[PDB]
Design a binder for these strands. Structure first.
Ligand SMILES: [K+]
Ligand SMILES: [K+]
Ligand SMILES: [K+]
Ligand SMILES: [Mg+2]
Ligand SMILES: [Mg+2]
Ligand SMILES: [Mg+2]
Ligand SMILES: [Mg+2]
Ligand SMILES: [Mg+2]
Ligand SMILES: [Mg+2]
Ligand SMILES: [Mg+2]
Ligand SMILES: [Mg+2]
Ligand SMILES: [Mg+2]
Ligand SMILES: [Mg+2]
Ligand SMILES: [Mg+2]
Ligand SMILES: [Mg+2]
Ligand SMILES: [Mg+2]
Ligand SMILES: [Mg+2]
Ligand SMILES: [Mg+2]
Ligand SMILES: [Mg+2]
Ligand SMILES: [Mg+2]
Ligand SMILES: [Mg+2]
Ligand SMILES: [Mg+2]
Ligand SMILES: [Mg+2]
Ligand SMILES: [Mg+2]
Ligand SMILES: [Mg+2]
Ligand SMILES: [Mg+2]
Ligand SMILES: [Mg+2]
Ligand SMILES: [Mg+2]
Ligand SMILES: [Mg+2]
Ligand SMILES: [Mg+2]
Ligand SMILES: [Mg+2]
Ligand SMILES: [Mg+2]
Ligand SMILES: [Mg+2]
Ligand SMILES: [Mg+2]
Ligand SMILES: [Mg+2]
Ligand SMILES: [Mg+2]
Ligand SMILES: [Mg+2]
Ligand SMILES: [Mg+2]
Ligand SMILES: [Mg+2]
Ligand SMILES: [Mg+2]
Ligand SMILES: [Mg+2]
Ligand SMILES: [Mg+2]
Ligand SMILES: [Mg+2]
Lengths: 386, 129, 63
RNA sequence: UUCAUCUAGACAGCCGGACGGUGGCCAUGGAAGUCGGAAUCCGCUAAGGAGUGUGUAACAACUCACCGGCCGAAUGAACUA
RNA sequence: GUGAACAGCCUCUAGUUGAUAGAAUAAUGUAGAUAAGGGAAGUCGGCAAAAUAGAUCCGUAACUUCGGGAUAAGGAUUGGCUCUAAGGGUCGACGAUCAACUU
RNA sequence: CUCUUAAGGUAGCCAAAUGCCUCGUCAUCUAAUUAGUGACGCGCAUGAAUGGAUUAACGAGAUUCCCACUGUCCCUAUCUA
RNA sequence: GCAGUCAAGCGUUCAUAGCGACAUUGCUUUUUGAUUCUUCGAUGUCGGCUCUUCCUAUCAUACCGAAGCAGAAUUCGGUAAGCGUUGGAUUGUUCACCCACUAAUAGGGAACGUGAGCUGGGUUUAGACCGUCGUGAGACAGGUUAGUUUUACCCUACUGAUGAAUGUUACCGCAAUAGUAAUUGAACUUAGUACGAGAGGAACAGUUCAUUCGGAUAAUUGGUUUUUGCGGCUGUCUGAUCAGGCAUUGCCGCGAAGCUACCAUCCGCUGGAUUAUGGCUGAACGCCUCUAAGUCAGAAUCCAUGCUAGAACGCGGUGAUUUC
RNA sequence: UGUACAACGGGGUAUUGUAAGCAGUAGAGUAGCCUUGGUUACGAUCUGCUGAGAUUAAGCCUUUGUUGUCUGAUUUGU
């Protein structure tokens, strides 16, 4: 017989299977459509989720109840030191999809990216790319031949970039290497840009700008094995239920004589790859810029780092991207920020945000002071010091 | 016409009657504009029109269904300016389906959202949030 | 943004921090955190709570 | 299959006429071809129903049966499986 | 000892330290708990849980077989410390001396 | 008036743990009540030690409502062994 | 139960806007029957709760055709099951009825889905009461009260999780296939405008929010407390103090971290092809005709873009490949 | 054999709420003594040193310090 009362199904069938992502770095499965009249530029960037804070800004939204009024918004900080270009990959189109034809690497690779090719770095002989570096012996004839092949072919060009994880407070010490598509046409000059940027850093400000809507691609926080009640949001069974109530009561009708894929079952929760879109960049902050957390209204010479440091992350000493809201993944996790795949003109995008204040109070508790100077001013002289 | 306010008054909630209509409490039986979800109680927030009865109060107001407007919530809600605020109690005022109050005066404060939503409530109100 | 003052502790309240309580007589109380909110709800006297600004002023602490 | 029209000009198509006795006789408040009952005539006719429909309170005004002007060879209807 | 108490809790004498262990801390369980706002809207049904609770003082309705109902209902107080007062025995209106708690 | 019995159900009580029709009818209780209570009684098929009616007190009996209370629920979350 | 065909009539006139008699043709197996083919060395027998999916005879939402369509509202019908279809009083109820919100509160199936998922209110063991019946033991689809709901560790299915073999190992990738998601409402404005004698009263575009759903996230607020972190309190024990033990986490207040809540915040894409339908050209059939050839636009539809997984017997690029 | 790692320590951050000890013309007072304006015994508590003391990664941040660690086993060939 029928359900006897309609209700929407629990969970989204388009995010199946609810399995662990194959890698801690979520893959970029679609790059922005190439506009071959633009200059050559990266379509994404690699950063590390540092943590969240809150900001205050004047809302510019005509017709809204809060137009020209102050709004408090949550923001996520992604530490984004410049990424080092170490290779270029050429992609030819085939009746069986895109196919990498060849990769040309830089002559010199730092130990940060060399660690990525080693499971046991400390006891290895560090031979990686030692014979490849000899391709640059006198004139780089083999390197130029491979680049000429990429120019003669490979309708799609991607660069190999790696993070400078040594510039982050993370203990990992092993860089993250990823392919970023080069948009801005003339495949010839795509390859030329890649080669000219070999071994050179690319700053996040050359990829992303203030107010730009971007997408965050990251592996979500893992939670291990989870029951149906929290994994899928199913109704808790009554207190009277024998054999447990954090379950799904009927996992299927008699026919089909099988548990169906669409029934909620207990299993892994989290550690899934997610591509969340339309996060507006609130700040493109620079690492060398003291008063990073300052605005034109605050003027307090303070960095973006909360007092006591970002909890479980550390201090932001590099360039950072501050996006509105939250993004998938937890602190210290590598996240790929990519340009939007379409042109958003909904007046939510195209809004020019101007921060009025950035919270730098401690996230290690109910933080009361933005700066140590403010703490001193409020508290006066203590016995230990200050 | 109003930002979302954290619901604090599901069906069955009894709030104080803050007007001078002669009712002393209002018993939520419905929330206007509320959606439908299996087992989900329709819940009211500050500024919401509800259907209510008068459990205790002047007798000719009792035993009948009337529109009411929630003017105080006491369940913490977040404003867009980041402030989490709540009143001391839950309070509402009797009104007609067009939003005009049955009484002529409000006792106590009135939520800014409710006053912005209902000009009659704002006109009869005293202190606003 | 305007910085408010904790009605109980006197601590500075930044946007989004703490809670706001409108008493029945329409008086506003701002609390920087749940500690001060809970002490107020428990009806503790800030003049007796040894870390509050009111207590330190009444005991001439810091000056 | 059957019955019909047709070079003495068929069907379709476009254009012209579509009148006179006459508002034929009758309730109807009004009914003039066109709410209805019966009556289905005569004239002039190449031809025109005491009217095929639209329309008016009634008229009026349009329209069609019917006959003509153009074209020029096939065409129409009811059935059968 | 606390306490009205052979209640509960801690301790003295005496006895035992016997239950297969080690490492982690997923789901679902068993047992114990908490929870914003609402307050039975859940459910056959307030099931379960929560709320109340000792003592002192105040106050206590309908009904009644006059015995009860009754701890009806409904209220206030309770710690610590320093004091005060009252309540006794023996010996020869008082004097001496001794002694323990209850209010 | 009849027919008719041994007598023809009296005092009481009732949609009651006894009423089919039936979720009976009226009132109250609720926003809404096949529930509860109070009434009515041509009562399928109530009724007097096969005891009738009523009863203070009592009840791990069945039932309705109200206050308090709360994760029973809205709508779940967290902690310990 | 649902749907047709005719068409005497209803619809002021008028069969077919909407209906529709007398008849007649069907469909369905969500009714109840009929039968007794399967099961009596046993398929757990009502209802509700939970959850998934399917059907369409579509209640709402999308786009439309028609009207006894002026507007608004409504009714009939088409493509359409993509999407949603509720909160309660009474009843064990399925059913029913009422209150109320809503865009709507559509109908159904899946062993009358679902008891090694629950519950056990009902029915339907044994106890007991009443009424009627019976001389009686006892009977009652009559009423009432109480009445043990057992087992998964196996196989498959499903959810997740490893993994041999391909020279080894490492990194970066491709994408066959499979899944897929967004939903609906209000307010402002259009506009008191079109329309209408009036009363009333839209729509397109633009804007702000909200409902339902989904994926995340913990800056803030709230919850949680073995941080047994700090403080306090009771009883007892360590001669007192300091400092502690025990009270199965002794209790209380605060409580960082972590986890977590529409109880918190953020985010949820745009191209093509189409259905119905409305058209172009244009014969068939000198006219006409959206159709026959050809062709335009067009739906919450479909396929893509996008998102998830990555074939563990699909593939590519790339680094290093054992001095003994 | 290092911008190495670890254990402590330091600093920051955060939680709680003012540690112990000493002192006091504080303290409701009660009971003794005399230089009758003081002193002795007990006294919840109060005040000052003292936003002190305690804790702070166990999944907080940081480190010009101290100490230490850094070749054990197995397997893999086109
Ligand atoms: K059988
Ligand atoms: K917390
Ligand atoms: K103790
Ligand atoms: Mg359904
Ligand atoms: Mg059970
Ligand atoms: Mg924090
Ligand atoms: Mg329900
Ligand atoms: Mg006429
Ligand atoms: Mg004693
Ligand atoms: Mg609660
Ligand atoms: Mg509460
Ligand atoms: Mg209450
Ligand atoms: Mg109920
Ligand atoms: Mg219910
Ligand atoms: Mg019930
Ligand atoms: Mg109980
Ligand atoms: Mg009492
Ligand atoms: Mg009583
Ligand atoms: Mg009688
Ligand atoms: Mg009776
Ligand atoms: Mg009765
Ligand atoms: Mg009830
Ligand atoms: Mg009897
Ligand atoms: Mg007994
Ligand atoms: Mg069996
Ligand atoms: Mg079976
Ligand atoms: Mg259909
Ligand atoms: Mg069944
Ligand atoms: Mg089963
Ligand atoms: Mg069972
Ligand atoms: Mg069942
Ligand atoms: Mg039973
Ligand atoms: Mg029985
Ligand atoms: Mg008998
Ligand atoms: Mg029977
Ligand atoms: Mg969630
Ligand atoms: Mg908190
Ligand atoms: Mg605790
Ligand atoms: Mg012991
Ligand atoms: Mg202890
Ligand atoms: Mg045409
Ligand atoms: Mg065609
Ligand atoms: Mg594979």
């Amino acid at each position: 017989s029928h359900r006897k009362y309609e209700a929407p199904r629990h969970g989204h069938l388009g995010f199946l299977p609810r399995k662990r992502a194959a890698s801690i770095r979520a893959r970029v499965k679609a790059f922005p459509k190439d506009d071959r009249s633009k200059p050559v530029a990266l379509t994404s960037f690699l950063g590390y989720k540092a943590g969240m804070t809150t900001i205050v800004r004047d809302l510019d939204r005509p017709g809204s109840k809060f137009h020209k009024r102050e709004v408090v918004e949550a923001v996520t900080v992604v530490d984004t030191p410049p990424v080092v270009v170490v290779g270029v990959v050429g992609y030819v189109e085939t009746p069986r999809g895109l196919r990498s034809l060849t990769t040309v690497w830089a002559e010199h690779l730092s130990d940060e990216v060399k660690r990525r090719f080693y499971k046991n770095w400390y006891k290895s002989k560090k031979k990686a790319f030692t014979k490849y570096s000899a391709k640059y012996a006198q004139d780089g004839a083999g390197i130029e031949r491979e680049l000429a092949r990429i120019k003669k072919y490979a309708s799609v060009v991607r660069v190999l970039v790696h993070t400078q994880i040594r510039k982050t407070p993370l203990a990992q010490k092993k860089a993250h290497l990823a392919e970023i598509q080069l948009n801005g046409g003339s495949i010839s000059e795509k390859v030329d840009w890649a080669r000219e940027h070999f071994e050179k850093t690319v700053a996040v400000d050359s990829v992303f700008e203030q107010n730009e809507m971007i997408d965050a691609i990251a592996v979500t926080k893992g939670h291990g094995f989870e029951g149906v009640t929290h994994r899928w949001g199913t109704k808790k069974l009554p207190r009277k239920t024998h054999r447990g109530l954090r379950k799904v009561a009927c996992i299927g009708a008699w026919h089909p004589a099988h548990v169906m894929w669409s029934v909620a079952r207990a299993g892994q929760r989290g550690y899934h790859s997610r591509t969340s879109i339309n996060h507006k960049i609130y700040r493109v902050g620079k690492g060398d810029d003291e008063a990073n957390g300052a605005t034109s209204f605050d003027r307090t010479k303070k960095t973006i780092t909360p007092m006591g440091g970002f909890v479980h992350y550390g201090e932001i000493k590099n360039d950072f991207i501050m996006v509105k809201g939250c993004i998938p993944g937890n602190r210290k996790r590598i996240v790929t920020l990519r340009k939007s795949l379409y042109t958003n003109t909904s007046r939510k995008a195209l809004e020019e945000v101007s921060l009025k204040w950035i919270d730098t109070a401690s996230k290690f508790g109910k933080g009361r002071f933005q700066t140590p100077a403010e703490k001193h001013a409020f508290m006066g002289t203590l016995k230990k010091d200050l | 016409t109003k930002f979302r306010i954290s619901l604090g008054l599901p069906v069955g909630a009894i709030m104080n009657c803050a007007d001078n209509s002669g009712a002393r409490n209002l018993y939520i039986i419905a929330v206007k504009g509320s959606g439908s979800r299996l087992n989900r109680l329709p819940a009211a927030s500050l500024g919401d029109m509800v259907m209510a009865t008068v459990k205790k109060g002047k007798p000719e107001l009792r035993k009948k269904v009337m529109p009411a407007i929630v003017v105080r919530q006491a369940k913490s809600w977040r404003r867009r300016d980041g402030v989490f605020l709540y009143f001391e109690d839950n309070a509402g005022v009797i009104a007609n389906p067009k939003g005009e109050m049955k009484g002529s005066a409000i006792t106590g404060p009135v939520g800014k959202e409710c006053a912005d939503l209902w000009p009659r409530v704002a006109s009869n109100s005293g202190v606003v949030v | 943004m305007k910085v408010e003052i904790d009605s109980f502790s006197g601590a500075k309240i930044y946007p989004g921090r703490g809670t706001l309580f409108v008493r029945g007589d329409s008086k506003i109380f701002r609390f920087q955190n749940s500690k001060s909110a809970s002490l107020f709800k428990q009806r503790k006297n800030p003049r007796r709570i040894a870390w509050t600004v009111l207590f330190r002023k009444h005991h001439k602490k810091g000056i």
